[PDB]
Design a protein around this ligand. Structure first.
Ligand SMILES: *[C@@H]1O[C@H](CO)[C@@H](O[C@@H]2O[C@H](CO)[C@@H](O[C@@H]3O[C@H](CO)[C@@H](O)[C@H](O)[C@@H]3O)[C@H](O)[C@H]2NC(C)=O)[C@H](O)[C@H]1NC(C)=O
Ligand SMILES: *[C@@H]1O[C@H](CO)[C@@H](O[C@@H]2O[C@H](CO)[C@@H](O)[C@H](O)[C@H]2NC(C)=O)[C@H](O)[C@H]1NC(C)=O
Ligand SMILES: *[C@@H]1O[C@H](CO)[C@@H](O[C@@H]2O[C@H](CO)[C@@H](O)[C@H](O)[C@H]2NC(C)=O)[C@H](O)[C@H]1NC(C)=O
Ligand SMILES: *[C@@H]1O[C@H](CO)[C@@H](O[C@@H]2O[C@H](CO)[C@@H](O)[C@H](O)[C@H]2NC(C)=O)[C@H](O)[C@H]1NC(C)=O
Ligand SMILES: *[C@@H]1O[C@H](CO)[C@@H](O[C@@H]2O[C@H](CO)[C@@H](O)[C@H](O)[C@H]2NC(C)=O)[C@H](O)[C@H]1NC(C)=O
Ligand code: NAG
Lengths: 376, 367, 49
């Protein structure tokens, strides 16, 4: 009967992620206490919608919020959470700063990417970026370009009206048919990557002599088989290591679920976003379990109130909840999970991948402290 | 016919400023009903929360429009609250890439003009220093063009680079003979960067600056006395022109009988006449307006729009007149249209007029 | 044709002759942009009234 209430802010199409979340609630539930989630489905890019949903969950008296943000709504989340001492736990892109009260499940990708580029000894390359998704990692490679001596051609792939799409993407590559660009970094959502891969193939630029780096954390989330036999180099990053028993044992289960009960979940792989979501349920569970193991009472006595109450006086136990969340250290689908004082993943590992004729293979790994390490 | 008083909300970041004095001056000039009755609030224009509070409070109090300022951190809330409620926001602030019809931008866009000026001097490799506060869409536009004309640009965000970061890149620049720098940012941050640049550049020989700003003449250009620096910019207002001068003369006497106006204050001045014109167009079109003093609540689902908001919006958008900032006119997207920007250059106090820029002709210059 | 494309042999340097009387009966659009030569025969002239 020990119900700790939490919120879940889910983007209007995040089916697999919600399935992953529901699975983790089952996996990690206990007689000690039951996380009782209240779920909102919303236009995550709409800051008004995001404020409404945050304030709606604040009023209910949730003890924390698991959720997603967009580059357009991230400030709403960090400001409201920072002001009210409400912890937000998210698989979204890590914030650009040290905002408090935000537990960022997703590791930083910039280090590994910068390291990979150096590894292949690149000096001149094209960088396809998606304004819809953000410029943060482009900026890191632009900052580094001088010191690392690179010539970067940055192309925005982010305002393509699906009306054309085919025509745009072909025009783009038949333009990189100017400066003789053959080394290309992607840096897109898995869908936009798929779209682009589809057009590279149609244009016949997936052959030997081209090399693509997919700059997301889910190298094998998409369909690589179709670009596997052209001859091009294709490299990427992977945080979910299907060779781990923890992961293998999870997928054994996940592949079995009824697709009707768990949309997105009758499969062999799982998007790194859904894996981070499952992992988030473990972290929240441990944090609140650990608050009891230390007899830190965190139960709200009076109503949380209105997120627009003035003055804004944050509740006393917010800081304890944040700390407990940030002190959690477990192993999960995304490997060792640990946070610094600003809720950023630390001591994590990112696998480096190349596509081969026999499929994606791990070629090494990137660590916070070891940087890039060739595996053998 | 209409109500005798048209309440107008205000979102101002300061208790006192030239903009405020411009706003009050323009208002004391008006003679015809409806009387524009200002009701402004001093607010942190960077905080979406404070901004939501003020906006809703003004919406509840029954204003017919809001005049004010926003920042990169608040544009989305305003665009969103304006679009959802059909209340117009008339603002001299830095224009945004995608906003809506309900937002009326007094400030002419600068990005096309700027690209013309670079294309003119056939620049190839240059530094682009910018305001992370407003110019995230402009950079991409600069990066886009760079791809097409094969420029080698070096992006530098004002908010994030340090004194030493600056030392360093001005150290890179002086390794080559002509140093080309674009600086796009607002006036207050502009001046602060000036002192930092001049000190770093020494004799100023071989340095060429393009300042993406509409108040070239507003700058402290004394910081450039005996600098070899070639400085190019943009002036929106000519104070010696007939209408502008008549206006300058009118409040110059207004304050004496009782300092050179910055462009934002000029925009504020013209923003008031836009509003004055808007409603007087509604009076002669004989459309009847009225609003609840009964605290019609703001937040709702869905957002219930002000039924006559579209009437006030069409009127504001159709405005055409000659103000302190030349020809004041808006396209259907809510932005300044049919405007001329004058291009100016300076060296050893070389105040020469390179020419002018406009949407149709782009840039035309003028042993 | 589907397999030639998957193998990446529809590029410049290869040339295919389709030896049937219906060159445009099938889907040529998909092998049109690789660069390969592709020739065939046609008995139905869609230009005839
Ligand atoms: C007006 O409201 C805005 C919030 O919308 C406040 O913006 C916040 O401003 C503070 C102070 O500038 C920023 O903090 C500074 O951040 C830098 C960079 O991380 C850090 O190095 C400094 O130590 C300082 O923390 C803060 O990040 C920013 N918040 C957001 C969401 O952008 C602003 O301070 C308010 N101003 C006034 C006078 O009330
Ligand atoms: C694809 O991958 C290979 C191996 O990383 C790249 O380099 C090959 O290996 C050595 C190391 O420099 C070179 O001397 C060879 O010439 C490369 N092999 C071949 C057959 O090209 C190779 O350059 C990569 N392709 C691109 C376009 O980056
Ligand atoms: C300001 O610097 C610019 C930079 O060159 C000068 O503009 C040039 O003028 C020369 C001489 O007439 C022309 O040949 C070029 O067309 C201009 N070049 C460029 C690159 O724009 C200008 O002369 C300088 N101003 C002063 C007062 O010296
Ligand atoms: C561009 O704006 C100018 C304002 O300067 C318009 O030109 C005026 O048009 C009026 C109305 O017919 C004439 O009475 C004036 O003689 C014109 N003035 C000047 C200074 O040229 C012009 O019509 C606008 N163009 C567009 C396409 O909107
Ligand atoms: C594809 O078609 C062309 C034209 O029929 C072939 O020959 C080209 O044209 C002349 C005529 O012999 C040659 O000298 C050129 O070298 C050919 N052009 C090119 C760029 O190859 C061409 O050989 C054909 N391809 C094949 C594999 O048969
Ligand atoms: C304003 O007009 C005066 C008229 O002589 C002219 O000198 C000046 O160039 C004009 N404006 C600008 C911005 O240069």
């Amino acid at each position: 009967s020990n119900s700790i209430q939490i919120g879940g802010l889910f983007p209007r199409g995040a089916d697999q992620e919600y399935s992953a979340f529901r699975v983790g609630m089952v996996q990690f539930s206990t007689s000690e206490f039951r996380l009782t989630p209240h779920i909102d489905n919303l236009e995550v890019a709409n800051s008004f919608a995001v404020t409404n949903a945050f304030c709606s969950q604040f009023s209910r008296g949730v003890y924390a919020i698991f959720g997603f943000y967009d580059k357009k709504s991230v400030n709403t989340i960090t400001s409201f959470c920072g002001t009210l001492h409400v912890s937000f736990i998210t698989p979204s892109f890590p914030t650009d700063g040290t905002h408090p009260f935000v537990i960022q499940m997703r590791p930083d990708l910039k280090g590994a990417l910068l390291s990979l580029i150096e590894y292949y000894q690149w000096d001149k390359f094209a960088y396809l970026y998606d304004s819809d998704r953000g410029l943060s990692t482009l900026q890191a490679v632009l900052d580094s370009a001088a010191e690392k001596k690179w010539q970067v051609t940055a192309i925005n792939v982010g305002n393509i009206n699906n009306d054309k799409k085919d025509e745009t993407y072909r025009s783009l590559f038949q333009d990189l048919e100017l400066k003789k660009e053959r080394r290309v970094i992607l840096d897109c959502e898995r869908d936009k990557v798929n779209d682009i891969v589809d057009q590279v193939i149609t244009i016949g630029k997936h052959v030997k002599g081209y090399h693509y780096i997919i700059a997301n954390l889910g190298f094998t989330d998409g369909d690589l088989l179709k670009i596997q036999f052209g001859g091009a180099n294709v490299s990427g990053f992977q945080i979910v290591d299907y060779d781990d028993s923890l992961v293998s044992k999870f997928i054994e289960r996940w592949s079995t679920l009824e697709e009707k009960e768990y949309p997105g979940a009758h499969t062999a792989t799982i998007k790194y976003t859904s894996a981070l979501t499952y992992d988030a349920v473990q972290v929240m569970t441990e944090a609140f379990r650990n608050l009891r193991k230390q007899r830190i009472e965190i139960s709200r006595r009076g109503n949380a109130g209105d997120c627009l109450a003035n003055p804004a006086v944050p509740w006393g136990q917010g800081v304890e909840i944040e700390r407990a969340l940030k002190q959690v250290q477990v192993e999960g689908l995304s490997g060792n999970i640990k946070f610094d004082q600003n809720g950023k993943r630390i001591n994590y590992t990112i696998n480096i991948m190349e596509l081969k004729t026999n499929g994606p293979r791990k070629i090494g790994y990137w660590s916070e402290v070891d940087k890039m390490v060739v595996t053998l | 016919n209409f109500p005798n008083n048209i309440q107008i909300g205000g979102l101002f970041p300061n208790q006192q400023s030239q903009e405020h004095a411009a706003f009050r001056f323009a208002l004391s000039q008006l003679t015809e009903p409806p009387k524009l009755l200002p009701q402004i609030d001093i607010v942190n224009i960077s905080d979406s929360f404070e901004m939501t509070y003020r906006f809703c409070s003004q919406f509840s109090k029954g204003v017919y429009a809001i005049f004010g300022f926003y920042e990169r951190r608040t544009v989305n809330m305003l665009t969103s609250f304006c679009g959802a409620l059909h209340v117009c926001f008339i603002t001299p602030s830095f224009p945004v890439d995608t906003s809506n019809q309900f937002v009326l931008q007094l400030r002419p866009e600068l990005q096309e003009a700027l690209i013309s000026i670079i294309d003119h001097y056939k620049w190839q490799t240059f530094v682009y220093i910018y305001d992370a506060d407003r110019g995230l869409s402009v950079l991409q536009r600069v990066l886009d063009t760079a791809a097409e004309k094969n420029w080698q640009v070096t992006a530098v965000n004002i908010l994030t680079t340090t004194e030493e970061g600056y030392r360093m890149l001005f150290q890179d620049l002086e390794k080559k003979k002509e140093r080309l720098v674009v600086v796009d940012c607002e006036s207050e941050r502009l001046n602060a960067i000036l002192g930092q640049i001049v000190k770093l550049e020494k004799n100023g020989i071989g340095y060429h600056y393009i300042l993406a700003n509409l108040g070239f003449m507003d700058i402290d250009l004394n910081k450039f006395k005996e600098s070899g620096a070639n400085v190019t910019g943009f002036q929106l207002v000519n104070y010696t022109d007939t209408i502008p001068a008549r206006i300058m003369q009118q409040w110059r006497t207004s304050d004496s009988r009782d300092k050179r106006p910055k462009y934002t204050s000029a925009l504020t001045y013209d923003g008031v006449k836009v509003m004055a014109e808007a409603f007087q167009s509604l009076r002669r079109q004989r459309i009847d307006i009225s609003r609840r003093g009964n605290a019609g609540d703001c937040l709702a689902n869905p957002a219930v729009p002000w039924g006559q908001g579209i009437d006030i919006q069409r009127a504001l958008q159709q405005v055409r007149f000659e103000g302190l900032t030349g020809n004041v006119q808006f396209n259907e997207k809510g932005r300044r249209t049919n405007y001329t920007l004058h291009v100016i250059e300076m060296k050893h106090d070389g105040i020469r007029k390179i020419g002018y820029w406009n949407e149709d002709d782009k840039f035309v210059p003028a042993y």
